Amino acid sequence: NAESQLQRIIRDLQDAVTELSKEFQEAGEPITDDSTSLHKFSYKLEYLLQFDQKEKATLLGNKKDYWDYFCACLAKVKGANDGIRFVKSISELRTSLGKGRAFIRYSLVHQRLADTLQQCFMNTKVTSDWYYARSPFLQPKLSSDIVGQLYELTEVQFDLASRGFDLDAAWPTF
């Protein structure tokens, strides 16, 4: 059911990763915002990040999302919070969704995504507080598959712009 849809999305993430690796190889230069495969990657990773996510909010009712999970895992982990601090310094980002997208893109630019997510999923305590059972992040068999795919991006360069779009509204398309 949901299991079969999960599995498909994990494969989609893999196909997006391979696409980016091929596009990189083909282009002979860093991936840019007009890559439809970066776009697909972004959406598949976000799907996974939102999958079986527990619902949470601030005391004023604003929505928390995976950005808030990343902060809980990493904001105080020395060495691990460069991207947390970067996104916290962007005044334009108004929502947890948008902040989380910025963090993913920062991580891609700096070739740290896999390592950062691996570090999140290692925190079993926080991950269990944010996710229901079927989340791949609670299952190494599945979480290392996803992390594994991500390590192939550790060698792909991304030259992603820092402005020219509104992440609170949408992933960039060019």
DSSP of 64-78, one letter per residue?
A: P-HHHHHHHHHSSST
User: Which residue, 160, 148, 146, 140, is CA-closest to 47?
Assistant: 146
131: which strand partners?
Answer: 53
Give the CA angle between residues 174, 108, 125 to the nearest 5°: 130
Contact 84, 75 (CB under 8 A): yes
Neighbours of 94 (CB within 10 A): 14
The two three-digit tokens of residue 72, written as one number: 């809980």
| 138: DSSP letter | G
Give the CA angle between residues 16, 22, 174 to the nearest 5°: 65
The resolution, in angstroms to one decimal, equals 1.3
| 162: DSSP letter | S
Helices marked H in 110-156 — which ranges?
113-122, 124-130, 140-151
158: which strand partners?
Answer: 31
Helix (H, G, I), strand (E, B) or coil at 31: strand
Q: What is the C-alpha separation between 71 and 85, in angstroms, rounded? A: 10
Helix (H, G, I), strand (E, B) or coil at 96: helix
Q: What is the C-alpha separation between 156 and 42, in angstroms, rounded? A: 15
Helix (H, G, I), strand (E, B) or coil at 57: strand
Label residues 127-137 b or e (16+ Cβ within 10 Å = b). Answer: beebbeeebbb
Q: What is the C-alpha separation between 100 and 117, in angstroms, rounded? A: 12
User: Which residue, 139, 109, 97, 116, is CA-closest to 6?
Assistant: 139
* Residue-range domains of the chain with CATH: 1-151 (1.20.58.900)
Q: How was this structure determined?
A: X-ray
Q: What is the C-alpha separation between 123 and 104, in angstroms, rounded? A: 18
